[PDB]
Design a protein around this ligand. Structure first.
Ligand code: 2RH
Ligand code: SF4
Ligand code: SF4
Ligand code: H2S
Lengths: 375, 399
């Protein structure tokens, strides 16, 4: 798998080079997609490249002219990069209005980064009402219209259906990797598990698919493994920094499942059958479950996490809490209770892209790991 | 007079709700810019968590509730109105301003998206019906036809839920009457609170607007509100003729203040501004609850709730502040950076640059919170206002 892992690392550590390469070879453009949910199938159908945008480790400077200190870490990073010019190879960006902070970012962007077209999109809360489906279809028609303004040609209905089968294929394959990885927990460390998944944001899905199938084939040709340490499930926005993942490994902790927005939330739910392309996409949003950004007065998130912990005999759950994220903060008390009431232990860890020090997380995680042991 | 009339009318709403609860009548909790017309048609009792939290905060009892919610696991980063409310439920009430638990919920996100998560939590923990009216943010200058159709359909769903909760049928004749009441009160709110703009000096202390506000929030569709605002108007107009007003101190400088007041300290703030001769005569809030539409027009009603100034693009937001400064004949602007409100805080820097450019006027600001006392510091407030006063005075020293 060495050749495959080297390929993945390359694009993840040098995304700008990968984007220019796609433009030179294909002669087509690239569009950025901001966190949680965008309709990638539409960009894909035009022959364009959908690039994921998830912040990064940076100090703040230019952003201080637009945000005060209490905006969430990830969005502080995204704005700084934007103002510094790091996204200039892109022909536009979709910034969905999922929360107060994403809404305010789009509005500042309009006057702060004039040269990169901002495409608006707001998902409905009443997502299960037939009237809500209709509204989202109109929102997606807007997105299609503005993508055509950019590229200079029509995006055909037949092609959107085609890109949808492609994306469902990729979702099925990632779910296959999740199971195999769980069966080879000693070989697949937290750093490798993250790389395999995250690399899917920086290439065409059809390419990523062939790569993961290869690795799956290589892994099944190896004996199943008896975990030598402790098993965990991670939940929250994201956990991709080298720092936090090395600490996990230092305590011989293995990640065998997740409820992270950057990871399994993306491929957990498929797009349904239909004759109308945009209708199929809209009904996907109706179907999503177990996420802090998807309206649900019953809060099924806790229950879904318990079911999965039981299936895989997992030893604990770690809340990876994005600094100053209000939706995740609102969820925390009720979700934690459903998990602990079932008998499963939990840990709190702050995620900060501007960190500086990490001795706190270090001591805390060591205690958790020891405790899981004596249990 | 009007002062006492308005205060007595508020306490009456609370007393009516308790009486409703001890019998078999259902009571609701609602966000401050929800389509109240839909519940008044059923003669339902309805209360407002935002009003309660500001009220207990002014009596210095909010910190205790916040700390109860924080010990349950809720982060201090969350809105102070939300934490105060979480503590109230856990504590089983409070004594400085009590209110009964609800049997149903009414949520509209025109003011912000935090109320969505807040009300999700309440619905789950208490097992009660949540009524949701989703007004998605306007990026375009005009409300899209798709938004109009979506809201109207959501009006229908809300009515079906309310027939079940209340056990009564929707009455078209009665819907018309309520629409007429609401339309007159909207216009009386806008007229009365705009009077400071064209009067030198103003007939009232600017802070007074935030006491009157509670009435237009909790009883917008009621006849008693009509009669109360007519009384208030008579009084202000006479002040305009006699040179009287609730403002103590000489009105030397006229300003616009951005943001809602820090309730745990409002007493210190009033005395401090008057000390320096400062009074607020330009405001955006007269436009918050006007909510104008043509009677019997569903499309017009949808557009009105959609376009409350928290839910429109940054260009439009900016225009509101520009017009209030020029119309009020103001000498400067003073900004509240409110730790609770991300929606207002995360566009403040750009909005304040633009306004100063268009009008040529001086500005300054301070840090605080509407309900949590840990966020405000007297000394800072003092130094900041003094600095703005020195600049405004150097100006007229030239004129
Ligand atoms: C913009 C205002 C209506 C918000 C205000 O009521 C509050 O939430 O305190
Ligand atoms: S506040 Fe939370 S959900 Fe919103 S943009 Fe930030 S991390 Fe994402
Ligand atoms: S203070 Fe701001 S965040 Fe809190 S409820 Fe009001 S509008 Fe929403
Ligand atoms: S996010």
């Amino acid at each position: 798998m060495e050749a495959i892992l080297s390929k993945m690392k390359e694009v993840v550590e040098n995304p700008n080079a990968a984007v220019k390469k796609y433009k030179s070879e294909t002669g087509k453009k690239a569009i950025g997609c901001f966190p949680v949910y965008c309709p990638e199938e539409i960009i894909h159908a035009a022959g364009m490249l959908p690039v994921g945008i998830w912040g990064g480790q940076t100090e703040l400077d230019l952003a201080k002219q637009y945000f005060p200190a209490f905006a969430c870490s990830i969005m502080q990073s995204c704005l700084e990069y934007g103002l510094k010019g790091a996204y200039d190879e892109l022909s536009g960006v979709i910034i969905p209005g999922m929360c107060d902070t994403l809404i305010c970012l789009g509005q500042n962007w309009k006057s702060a980064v004039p040269h990169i077209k901002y495409i608006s999109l707001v998902h409905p809360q009443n997502r299960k009402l037939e009237a809500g489906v209709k509204y989202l279809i109109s929102e997606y028609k807007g997105v299609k219209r503005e993508l055509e303004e950019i590229c200079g040609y029509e995006i055909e209905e037949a092609k959107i259906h085609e890109s949808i089968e492609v994306y469902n294929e990729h979702r099925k394959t990632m779910r296959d990797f999740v199971e195999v990885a769980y069966k080879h927990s000693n070989t697949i460390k937290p750093s490798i598990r993250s790389l395999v998944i995250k690399s899917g944001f920086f290439m065409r899905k059809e390419e990523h698919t062939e790569l993961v199938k290869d690795l799956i084939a290589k892994l099944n040709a190896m004996p199943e493994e008896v975990c030598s340490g402790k098993k965990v499930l991670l939940t929250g926005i994201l956990a991709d920094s080298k720092d936090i993942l090395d600490i996990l490994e230092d305590n011989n902790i293995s990640v065998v499942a997740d409820d992270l927005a950057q990871e399994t939330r993306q491929f957990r739910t498929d797009v349904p059958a239909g004759d109308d392309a945009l209708e199929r996409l809209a009904r996907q949003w109706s179907n999503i479950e177990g996420c802090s950004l998807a309206y649900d007065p019953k809060k099924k998130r806790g229950s879904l996490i318990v079911d999965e912990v039981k299936k895989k005999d997992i030893d604990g759950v770690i809340f990876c809490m994005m600094k100053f994220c209000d939706p995740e903060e609102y969820d925390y008390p009720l979700v934690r209770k459903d998990i602990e009431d079932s008998g499963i232990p939990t840990l709190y860890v702050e995620i900060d892209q501007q960190t500086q020090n990490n001795e706190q997380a270090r001591t805390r995680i060591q205690t958790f790991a020891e405790m899981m042991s004596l249990a | 007079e009007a002062r006492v009339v308005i205060n007595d009318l508020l306490a009456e709403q609370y007393a009516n709700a308790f009486k409703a609860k001890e019998e078999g009548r259902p009571v609701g909790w609602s966000t401050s810019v929800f389509p109240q017309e839909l519940a008044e048609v059923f003669d339902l009792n309805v209360l407002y968590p935002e009003n309660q939290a500001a009220g207990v905060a002014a009596k210095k009892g909010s910190l205790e509730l916040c700390e109860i919610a924080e010990s349950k696991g809720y982060s201090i980063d969350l809105c102070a109105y939300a934490r105060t409310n979480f503590g109230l439920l856990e504590n089983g009430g409070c004594e400085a301003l009590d209110m009964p638990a609800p049997d149903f919920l009414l949520c509209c996100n025109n003011i912000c998206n935090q109320v969505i998560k807040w009300y999700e939590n309440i619905s789950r923990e208490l097992d009660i019906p949540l009524i949701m009216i989703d007004t998605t943010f306007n990026n375009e200058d005009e409300v899209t036809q798709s938004r109009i159709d979506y809201i109207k359909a959501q009006f229908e769903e809300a009515i079906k839920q309310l027939e079940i909760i209340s056990g009564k049928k929707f009455d078209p004749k009665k819907f018309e009457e309520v629409m007429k009441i609401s339309a007159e009160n909207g216009r009386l709110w806008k007229y009365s609170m705009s009077l400071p703009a064209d009067s030198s000096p103003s007939p009232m202390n600017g802070f007074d607007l935030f006491t009157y506000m509670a009435v237009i929030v909790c009883a917008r569709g009621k006849k008693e509100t009509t009669e109360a605002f007519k009384l208030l108007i008579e009084e202000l107009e006479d002040n305009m003729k006699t040179g009287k007003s609730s403002f103590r101190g000489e009105e030397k400088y006229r300003i616009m203040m951005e943001g809602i007041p820090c309730w745990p300290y409002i007493g210190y703030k009033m005395k401090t501004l008057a000390k320096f001769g400062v009074n607020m005569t330009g405001s955006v809030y007269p436009h918050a609850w006007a909510l104008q539409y043509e009677v019997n027009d569903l499309d017009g009603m949808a557009v009105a709730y959609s376009t409350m100034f928290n839910n429109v693009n940054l260009d439009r937001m900016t225009k509101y502040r520009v017009d209030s400064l020029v119309e009020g004949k103001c000498d400067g602007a003073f900004y509240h950076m409110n730790r609770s409100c991300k929606l207002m805080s995360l566009i403040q820097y750009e909005m304040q640059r633009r306004a100063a450019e268009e009008t040529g006027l001086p500005y300054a600001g301070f840090d605080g919170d509407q309900a949590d006392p840990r966020a405000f510091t007297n000394a800072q407030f003092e130094t900041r206002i003094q600095g703005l006063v020195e600049v405004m005075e150097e100006r007229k020293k030239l004129n």
